[PDB]
Amino acid sequence: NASQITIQARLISFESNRQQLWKLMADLNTPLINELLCQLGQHPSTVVSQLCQPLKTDPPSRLYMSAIHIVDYIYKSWSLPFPLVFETNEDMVWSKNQKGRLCVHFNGLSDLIFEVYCGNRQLHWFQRFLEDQQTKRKSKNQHSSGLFTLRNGHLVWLEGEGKGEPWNLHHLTLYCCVDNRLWTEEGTEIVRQEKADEITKFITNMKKKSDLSDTQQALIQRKQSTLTRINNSFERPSQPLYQGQSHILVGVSLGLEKPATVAVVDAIANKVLAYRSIKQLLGDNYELLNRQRRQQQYLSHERHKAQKNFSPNQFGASELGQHIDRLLAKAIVALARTYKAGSIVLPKLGDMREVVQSEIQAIAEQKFPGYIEGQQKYAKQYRVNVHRWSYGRLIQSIQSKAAQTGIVIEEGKQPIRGSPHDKAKELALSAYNLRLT
RNA sequence: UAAUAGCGCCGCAAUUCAUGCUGCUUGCAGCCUCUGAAUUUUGUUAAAUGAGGGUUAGUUUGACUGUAUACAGUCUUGCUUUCUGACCCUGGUAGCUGCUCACCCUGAUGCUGCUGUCAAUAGACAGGAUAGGUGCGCUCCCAGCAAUAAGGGCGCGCUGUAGUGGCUACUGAAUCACCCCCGAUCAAGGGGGAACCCGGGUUGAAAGGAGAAGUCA
DNA sequence: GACTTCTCAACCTCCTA
DNA sequence: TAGGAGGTTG
Numbered sequence: 052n053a054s055q056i057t058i059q060a061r062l063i064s065f066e067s068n069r070q071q072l073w074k075l076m077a078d079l080n081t082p083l084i085n086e087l088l089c090q091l092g093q094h095p096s097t098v099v100s101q102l103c104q105p106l107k108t109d110p111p112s113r114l115y116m117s118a119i120h121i122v123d124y125i126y127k128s129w130s131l132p133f134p135l136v137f138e139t140n141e142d143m144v145w146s147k148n149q150k151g152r153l154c155v156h157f158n159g160l161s162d163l164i165f166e167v168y169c170g171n172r173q174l175h176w177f178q179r180f181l182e183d184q185q186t187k188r189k190s191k192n193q194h195s196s197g198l199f200t201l202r203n204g205h206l207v208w209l210e211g212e213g214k215g216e217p218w219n220l221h222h223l224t225l226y227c228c229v230d231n232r233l234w235t236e237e238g239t240e241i242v243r244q245e246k247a248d249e250i251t252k253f254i255t256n257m258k259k260k261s262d263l264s265d266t267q268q269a270l271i272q273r274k275q276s277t278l279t280r281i282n283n284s285f286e287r288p289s290q291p292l293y294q295g296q297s298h299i300l301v302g303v304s305l306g307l308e309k310p311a312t313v314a315v316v317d318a319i320a321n322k323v324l325a326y327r328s329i330k331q332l333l334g335d336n337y338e339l340l341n342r343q344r345r346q347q348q349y350l351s352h353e354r355h356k357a358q359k360n361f362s363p364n365q366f367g368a369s370e371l372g373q374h375i376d377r378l379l380a381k382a383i384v385a386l387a388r389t390y391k392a393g394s395i396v397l398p399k400l401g402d403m404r405e406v407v408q409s410e411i412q413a414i415a416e417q418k419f420p421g422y423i424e425g426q427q428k429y430a431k432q433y434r435v436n437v438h439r440w441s442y443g444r445l446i447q448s449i450q451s452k453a454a455q456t457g458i459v460i461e462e463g464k465q466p467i468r469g470s471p472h473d474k475a476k477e478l479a480l481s482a483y484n485l486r487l488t
Numbered sequence: 489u490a491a492u493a494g495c496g497c498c499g500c501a502a503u504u505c506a507u508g509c510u511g512c513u514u515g516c517a518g519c520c521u522c523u524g525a526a527u528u529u530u531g532u533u534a535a536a537u538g539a540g541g542g543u544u545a546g547u548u549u550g551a552c553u554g555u556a557u558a559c560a561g562u563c564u565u566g567c568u569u570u571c572u573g574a575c576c577c578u579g580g581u582a583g584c585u586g587c588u589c590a591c592c593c594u595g596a597u598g599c600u601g602c603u604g605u606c607a608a609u610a611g612a613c614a615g616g617a618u619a620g621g622u623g624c625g626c627u628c629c630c631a632g633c634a635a636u637a638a639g640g641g642c643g644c645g646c647u648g649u650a651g652u653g654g655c656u657a658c659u660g661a662a663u664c665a666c667c668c669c670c671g672a673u674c675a676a677g678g679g680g681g682a683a684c685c686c687g688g689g690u691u692g693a694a695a696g697g698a699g700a701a702g703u704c705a
Numbered sequence: 706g707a708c709t710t711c712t713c714a715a716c717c718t719c720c721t722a
Numbered sequence: 723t724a725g726g727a728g729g730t731t732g
Contacts, residue, residue, distance in 0.1 A: 057698035374570040436496035
């Protein structure tokens, strides 16, 4: 699931409650470090479960389980404590304070009621969590847990500049992972379909082998309980999702001179419905692209100047590149949705060094026809000014936005040469040609 | 005193276009009114970019419902970012750390560069982001430096007190989004104005997917 | 900071209120 | 009886 998103909010409680939480978070981060050395040594994560059992009594029943999950994630990789991650829809017990504000009541923290401070841009998510738990409560456990839009969340701390306090210094911040497709009823239908198929496959696979007479029956019981409860739905808003025209393919072309260009082209026909260039996708946000290029030049010169012995290089850095890589994805997806596009085509990220090198060469021979010295000099001067874009965050942001809206993404092969509009059109057509296979 | 030239950018002009407009003939035909694209050629334009360091639980970007992408209704919380304004500053004082250096010569993706006044010492003091060059920046150029790229020479294995940096602690100013006043700042809002529009509104906007750990750049 | 992997329960099952 | 906290699992 690439459609799922993460929301955040700041929690606000008394000084005493924060004190208890800080003490427990320290008493939980201290032993999980000890669990690491024990865990890592034996391998050269199922055994980890009974590995923590002796560690239980050494120094929050649901919270000791939490540290187990974090380690498993680190292993498979190959004064703030670590976040307390809640890998359960039902770990948090939402409520509404007497003053109307929401509250969170964590499972292991019986007396720790935090007040939820968030933004109105995303208060509807917390209200949805509340309504979901309330709907389960009204139905008396007759709704499957797969559909409360709240997959998991982890509580983190944050740094402050007061420099005078153990926790008054630090700010709580809740990070709930919420499946965006789980908001509308029609999307929850597809989510229910996929989850039912997964449950069927998993139960068939597990029935095909033999397990313990009690754990196997209990897990299978939960499976059919989920299958029974999942058919009863919630009173969620209805939206017609997205239709998608198969023949219409929005082709997106990445380069150096133009950071990104698009081409809405028919595939059954051979006509381009409408091109858009980088100056036209970024409506009134083009000065942002220019100043980001200037900043990426300045920061690269500074990084080169710093050489080997340096102070931290984030001086003057920002997330302007990310803001532009999101403004661009929003515009590209909106353009796709306007023309009923069924898919957005993106270049393979692997072919993004060869493409930029070839584009630099093409510009060089375009300026200096055969004067090789001038071509090399201009290539150097161009690489000085027009730095390489960040073609990873852009492809990722488009993948997120399109998946959220409902537009599937395919990948083709960007042509080596030609005008950026022609490159985009031919990429889009090549994608359809390969889809025909 | 000098900044030629070069490259990126930004507009301003032309020209050809269509990603545009109109016409139906529905894919052709005109054109350039708009919206843009592509060349090349300009820098007057109060034309458009750009313009040191900071300052808001800042405004807008919102949800659902009914109707037809709009409007009406209801709810709304201050999270993380990005711009634009506006404002403030160009800092103390007290410790500590890092680097560099006998001298020349080359002069680096090196350093520094604003006004005014006083001295005309090398610095103060008042202003202050229009801050060396050009419409705007640069790893380019220019002026001074250059021991703090690199290399070359060359005194007695040293030349070492200065030049630059970093850090902590307590501090200074602005704690803002029409303006002021009193608050809050693990929360908390209230009060008083003014302009504009028609007792109500307005008095800038945007975007969010997080975390972990590696691989590096 | 910017690129690369990786994660995104759930009904059961007691046990106090 | 309805939450609260644990419990377990490919």
